[PDB]
Amino acid sequence: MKRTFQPSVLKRNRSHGFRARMATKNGRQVLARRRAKGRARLTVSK
Amino acid sequence: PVYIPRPRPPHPRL
Amino acid sequence: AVVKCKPTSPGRRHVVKVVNPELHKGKPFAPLLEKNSKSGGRNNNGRITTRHIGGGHKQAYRIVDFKRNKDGIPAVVERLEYDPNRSANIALVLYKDGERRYILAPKGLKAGDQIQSGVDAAIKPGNTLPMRNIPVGSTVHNVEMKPGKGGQLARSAGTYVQIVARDGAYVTLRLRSGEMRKVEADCRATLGEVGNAEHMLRVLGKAGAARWRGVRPTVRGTAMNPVDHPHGGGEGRNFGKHPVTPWGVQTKGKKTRSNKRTDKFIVRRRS
Amino acid sequence: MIREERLLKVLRAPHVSEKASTAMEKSNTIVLKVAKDATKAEIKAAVQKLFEVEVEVVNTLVVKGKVKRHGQRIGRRSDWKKAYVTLKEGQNL
RNA sequence: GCUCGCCGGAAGACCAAGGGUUCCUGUCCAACGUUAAUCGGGGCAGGGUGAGUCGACCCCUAAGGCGAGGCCGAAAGGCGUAGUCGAUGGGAAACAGGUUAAUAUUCCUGUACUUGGUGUUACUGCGAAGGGGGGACGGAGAAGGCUAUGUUGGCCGGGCGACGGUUGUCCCGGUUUAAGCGUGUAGGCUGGUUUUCCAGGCAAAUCCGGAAAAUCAAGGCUGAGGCGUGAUGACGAGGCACUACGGUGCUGAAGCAACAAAUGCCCUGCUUCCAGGAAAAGCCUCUAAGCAUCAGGUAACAUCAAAUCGUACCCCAAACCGACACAGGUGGUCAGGUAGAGAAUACCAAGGCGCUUGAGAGAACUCGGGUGAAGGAACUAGGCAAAAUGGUGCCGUAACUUCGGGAGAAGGCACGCUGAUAUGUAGGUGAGGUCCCUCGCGGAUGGAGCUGAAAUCAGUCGAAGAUACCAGCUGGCUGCAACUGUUUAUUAAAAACACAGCACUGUGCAAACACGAAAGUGGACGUAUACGGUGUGACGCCUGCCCGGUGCCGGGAGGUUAAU
RNA sequence: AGGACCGAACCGACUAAUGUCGAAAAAUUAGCGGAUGACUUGUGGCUGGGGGUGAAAGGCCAAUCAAACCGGGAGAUAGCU
Numbered sequence A: 001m002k003r004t005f006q007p008s009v010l011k012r013n014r015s016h017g018f019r020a021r022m023a024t025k026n027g028r029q030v031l032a033r034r035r036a037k038g039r040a041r042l043t044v045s046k
Numbered sequence B: 001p002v003y004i005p006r007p008r009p010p011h012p013r014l
Numbered sequence C: 001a002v003v004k005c006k007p008t009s010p011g012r013r014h015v016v017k018v019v020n021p022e023l024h025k026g027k028p029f030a031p032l033l034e035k036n037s038k039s040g041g042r043n044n045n046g047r048i049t050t051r052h053i054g055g056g057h058k059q060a061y062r063i064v065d066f067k068r069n070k071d072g073i074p075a076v077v078e079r080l081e082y083d084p085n086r087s088a089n090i091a092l093v094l095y096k097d098g099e100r101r102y103i104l105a106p107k108g109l110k111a112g113d114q115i116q117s118g119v120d121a122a123i124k125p126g127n128t129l130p131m132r133n134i135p136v137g138s139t140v141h142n143v144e145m146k147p148g149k150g151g152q153l154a155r156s157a158g159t160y161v162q163i164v165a166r167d168g169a170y171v172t173l174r175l176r177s178g179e180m181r182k183v184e185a186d187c188r189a190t191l192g193e194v195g196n197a198e199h200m201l202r203v204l205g206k207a208g209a210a211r212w213r214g215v216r217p218t219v220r221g222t223a224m225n226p227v228d229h230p231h232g233g234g235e236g237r238n239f240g241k242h243p244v245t246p247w248g249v250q251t252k253g254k255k256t257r258s259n260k261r262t263d264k265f266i267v268r269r270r271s
Numbered sequence D: 001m002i003r004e005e006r007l008l009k010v011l012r013a014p015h016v017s018e019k020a021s022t023a024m025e026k027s028n029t030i031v032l033k034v035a036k037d038a039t040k041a042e043i044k045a046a047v048q049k050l051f052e053v054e055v056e057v058v059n060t061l062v063v064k065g066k067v068k069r070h071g072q073r074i075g076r077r078s079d080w081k082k083a084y085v086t087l088k089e090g091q092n093l
Numbered sequence E: 001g002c003u004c005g006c007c008g009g010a011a012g013a014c015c016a017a018g019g020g021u022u023c024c025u026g027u028c029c030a031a032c033g034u035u036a037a038u039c040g041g042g043g044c045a046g047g048g049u050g051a052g053u054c055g056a057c058c059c060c061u062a063a064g065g066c067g068a069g070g071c072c073g074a075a076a077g078g079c080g081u082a083g084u085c086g087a088u089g090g091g092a093a094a095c096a097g098g099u100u101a102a103u104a105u106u107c108c109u110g111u112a113c114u115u116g117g118u119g120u121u122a123c124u125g126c127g128a129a130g131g132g133g134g135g136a137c138g139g140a141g142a143a144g145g146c147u148a149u150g151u152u153g154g155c156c157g158g159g160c161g162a163c164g165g166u167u168g169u170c171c172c173g174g175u176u177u178a179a180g181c182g183u184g185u186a187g188g189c190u191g192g193u194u195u196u197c198c199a200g201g202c203a204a205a206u207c208c209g210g211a212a213a214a215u216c217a218a219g220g221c222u223g224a225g226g227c228g229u230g231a232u233g234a235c236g237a238g239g240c241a242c243u244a245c246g247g248u249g250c251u252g253a254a255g256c257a258a259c260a261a262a263u264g265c266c267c268u269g270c271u272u273c274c275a276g277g278a279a280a281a282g283c284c285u286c287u288a289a290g291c292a293u294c295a296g297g298u299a300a301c302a303u304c305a306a307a308u309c310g311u312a313c314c315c316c317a318a319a320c321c322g323a324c325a326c327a328g329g330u331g332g333u334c335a336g337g338u339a340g341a342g343a344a345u346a347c348c349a350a351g352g353c354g355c356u357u358g359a360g361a362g363a364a365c366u367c368g369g370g371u372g373a374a375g376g377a378a379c380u381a382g383g384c385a386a387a388a389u390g391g392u393g394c395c396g397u398a399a400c401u402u403c404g405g406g407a408g409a410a411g412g413c414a415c416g417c418u419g420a421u422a423u424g425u426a427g428g429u430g431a432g433g434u435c436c437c438u439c440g441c442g443g444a445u446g447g448a449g450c451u452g453a454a455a456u457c458a459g460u461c462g463a464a465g466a467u468a469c470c471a472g473c474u475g476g477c478u479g480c481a482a483c484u485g486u487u488u489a490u491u492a493a494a495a496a497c498a499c500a501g502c503a504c505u506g507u508g509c510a511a512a513c514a515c516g517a518a519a520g521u522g523g524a525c526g527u528a529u530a531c532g533g534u535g536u537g538a539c540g541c542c543u544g545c546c547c548g549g550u551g552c553c554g555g556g557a558g559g560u561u562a563a564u
Numbered sequence F: 001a002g003g004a005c006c007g008a009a010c011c012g013a014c015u016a017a018u019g020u021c022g023a024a025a026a027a028u029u030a031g032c033g034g035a036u037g038a039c040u041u042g043u044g045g046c047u048g049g050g051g052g053u054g055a056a057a058g059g060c061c062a063a064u065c066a067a068a069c070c071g072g073g074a075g076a077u078a079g080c081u
């Protein structure tokens, strides 16, 4: 049985990374929401 | 339990 | 030319091939190739605009001279090559100034033959010259639609147009479709039919012989569900509708041309 | 030219262990805990001056900090750089 | 520690992705481990990841992303030029030994190689966002030469056997060594050279392309492997000295030949086919502006730098995805012996493991198996499931057929071992010797060896000789679908979908059509022998009548008829 | 030569049993089909919700699909419990 999460740092970043966020407007609004909620880790950029 | 297993289908009493 | 592949396996049984011996059995000319990446119907936004396009073989694009703007300078057909981008066989040609190009092969043109373009060429097949200097009624090919455009009509295997008449600065062409068009007489036109006339005799035998030409299958409307296509759903082979494309526009007889900016150049409509 | 006010910053502490012992024993190599960036040439010059001993090659690595569950809190330690300095021949501490 | 069992194209070994200390040592058993725990991938502490050469980084580009200006768009924003990012590809270079508790192509020893900086040394036209060459390519097949590698032989060392025999064509073990440098092979491709001219290479160019004429018949490039060297060195069966009982310090023999041989290397080669098989740079030349003691180029020597990050550990798994130490999934590399066609399979090697609860008992009943009297489908919805068949060689093989098939039809016969033909055959391989000359990694002859079928004849054993594992059940009639394929991930694999073929129909290119308020893009860098849509579905024989209706196409003379 | 044949890896999922608070939220065992291709696979990329993709089953689109998931309108509305 092949599950869903096949991890890969490259794809993980390119899709949800910090610069993938700050690229477009919607992503920057996502960042704004994360900061307004005050999260420790804004994006997934371990 | 966030996963809630579906119930098995009931006998087809048609 | 046309060979029937022996029925030594189902799917080989029906094949009819065009085994052209004269075709050059080597690599194509290097400085005239360039990469031709496949698309699969998709476009900028990335959606399948033309269905059924996909898969197949890699192929590089042979830069064929369609313009034939090298006047006077003779040239000799070095060789004839198979082009995957066309149905006609290309010809690597060399001009007396060491410059080598590609052209489409007219019917009667072996390697070693000789041709040259411009107003003062002869009327031997392969020669290009404006359609004012080409006689009336002769069969030409690789026809232009604008002076300097490049040549757009009759580019496919075995095809050809015919100059029916020249009325002033305009030549009337019995286009391969049977449509009588009317373009400027100052548009060059290569002489003689296009070769590879035996192209339409191959039969491809099996489904793979198309899948590697790059045509994913076409699913009938009737098979699909009601949401997928106008012809949709049913309790077993139900139609009751009128034939339309997947977007509900009538197929099987509906004129879908509206230009209004070129309808003046059509002498008479299709047959 | 590499300034003294940086050479006095590069070197932090001399690593001591079984490996540092045996290295000083058999290969004339002193093991040091050097600063984070601490390029091989920086360490070279800093030892050539501060220790005034003769350096041949500097071989450096960065060890990663352990994760340490102090009490019930997941901690971590700093990733620091350890540099092996092969002195030419003479002596050192 | 000794036996026992299992795996061994894996349950072994090394990586990538992924994880992130799980690696090693010391200490502890509260929790975690489906039990116990002194043990642990658990808790605490300490240690451990060393690079000019490996990867990243970096140069170059693919798909594709972003995208100055730009075109478009209520706004956000879309597309896109120049451009710039992007490997899953292209681009310089290290090997063998030794070592740690844990790293080692990184440390140590030895042996190298690459790219640039700079300086002196001479000789020199150098010079690019530009030209050309190159890099630069498919599938399949086949053969030749090789190698890894193994087997045997020969040596070297040791042994003379817990009960019969065993100093002998007896037993066990080792017989290994690299990169680099030199060589230029088997073999692969290619004519070469000098001049001269030219509307091509957006200008130039001697470079490329293209013509001429002479030219000698050779050269050029590619090239596995081998040989020499690397190496009077390392490694080495082992022996001894001391035992932190762990292993340390020394000494250390032989270290050859033949044969077999890869799916690996020559080979990106060769032959062949149609489906016609990335790009850019590094690389080599050509010149443009500019400079021509200079600069810069080449060569020689010296010298310097090769930074930064990764490197522990798991990696068909208790460490990655599956909530679990979960019978699941996970890409790449190596692949030994015997039997075998085989990477199957059986038993084994190196190596690893005994699957983290066990002990008894030997009820029913359930699961996985084994055997079975007589009968042999009578069971049942249905021969479901089991049983059975199963190999190689030869003989033989029907209807039907689209002439290919059907067909492994069906069916039968031989198969072990020993001996001889034949102190092993046919064959393969090939030394020595000898001759020739292009004189060699050469050719011709020659056969020592070293292997080694297959067949026949004779004998023999057993109930059985394809003896285990492995390994077709066969035939007859028939519906449907031509066939290979695809399908409801997870109750439906089919007659459904697709298909090649056929037809109608649209489409004359700024094509139709499609995504998109548009710009645009796909169609297509295609052009009616093309593209789209619809139906039908190989093939054979064919496809009949109806236009009243709905739709489509064509007309415009008349009625009605919108905005105005 | 061949969408050729037998048959491992690999891909799949036809039968049967087991399993059905499983070892496993679809598996194991024994068989079974393809196995040079309309094949399979690694890495990266593209198409996004009335949208995608679809050899077409209403299939798949993160264990969810006759219209995903998250947040908002939202304390929708519920003559029904």
Ligand SMILES: [Mg+2]
Pocket: C051, C052, C218
């Ligand atoms: Mg189509």
Ligand SMILES: [Mg+2]
Pocket: C218
């Ligand atoms: Mg069709």
Ligand SMILES: [Mg+2]
Pocket: C217, C218, C219, C220
């Ligand atoms: Mg169809």
Ligand SMILES: [Mg+2]
Pocket: C226, C227, C229, C230
């Ligand atoms: Mg509809």
Ligand SMILES: [Mg+2]
Pocket: C234, C235, C236
């Ligand atoms: Mg139905």
Ligand SMILES: [Mg+2]
Pocket: C235, C236, C237
């Ligand atoms: Mg019906």
Ligand SMILES: [Mg+2]
Pocket: D057, D059
């Ligand atoms: Mg070093």
Ligand SMILES: [Mg+2]
Pocket: none
């Ligand atoms: Mg291991």
Ligand SMILES: [Mg+2]
Pocket: none
């Ligand atoms: Mg820990």
Ligand SMILES: [Mg+2]
Pocket: none
């Ligand atoms: Mg441990």
Ligand SMILES: [Mg+2]
Pocket: none
């Ligand atoms: Mg206790």
Ligand SMILES: [Mg+2]
Pocket: none
């Ligand atoms: Mg316990």
Ligand SMILES: [Mg+2]
Pocket: E042
């Ligand atoms: Mg621990």
Ligand SMILES: [Mg+2]
Pocket: D060, D061, E051
């Ligand atoms: Mg390092």
Ligand SMILES: [Mg+2]
Pocket: E067, E080
């Ligand atoms: Mg853009």
Ligand SMILES: [Mg+2]
Pocket: none
């Ligand atoms: Mg770049």
